[PDB]
Amino acid sequence: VAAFLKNVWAKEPVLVASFAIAGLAVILPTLSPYTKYSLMINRATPYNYPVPLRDDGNMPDVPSHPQDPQGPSLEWLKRL
Amino acid sequence: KQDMPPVGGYGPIDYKRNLPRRGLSGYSMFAVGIGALLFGYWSMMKWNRERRRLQIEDFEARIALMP
């Protein structure tokens, strides 16, 4: 079968270039750790408005001042 | 006694057929192509990623107003 990938590429190298780009396209999102950053960037882009909550017992975290060390880690993008 | 053909001075010109100048072929091409194309996508992810950062700043000025 190892000649079939070289004796049709002497006759029609047209669709062979298509399968070579059809392949190596489905394969790569299962490979590089650059993906799931593509979902991590896409999650912390605020469209709507952040409504606040109310104190009742808890008090889990995040007081009235926003610039306190209160919220989660989305500040790795400015270092990126 | 005034007739044409010279005693000497001739060529001739060829009957030949040749201009096969190569040409940068045969794994030299398909190597400058991919090496150029990967420089393109490497020049992406430094602009398209950076524009998404300024994008959030554009939404930022919206949210700090509208109460």
- Listing DSSP states for A22-69 in one string gives HTTTSSGGGT-TTTTTHHHHTTS---S-------BSB--S--S-TTSS
B-chain CB neighbours of A77 within 8 Å are 53
Entry resolution in angstroms? Answer: 7.8
To the nearest whole Å, the CA of A1 is away from the closest chain B CA by: 24
C-beta atoms of A46 and B55 within 8 A: no
- Listing DSSP states for B19-60 in one string gives -----S-SSSTTTHHHHHHHHHHHHSSSSHHHHHHHHHHHHH
B contact test, residue of A40, A41, A67, A74 with most B CBs within 10 A:
A41
Locate tokens 């107003």: which residue? B65
Structure tokens at B13: 């010109």
C-beta atoms of A77 and B53 within 8 A: yes
Which residues, in sequence order, are bridge partners of residue A56? A58
To the nearest whole Å, the CA of B11 is away from the closest chain A CA by: 44
Structure tokens at B29: 């091409």
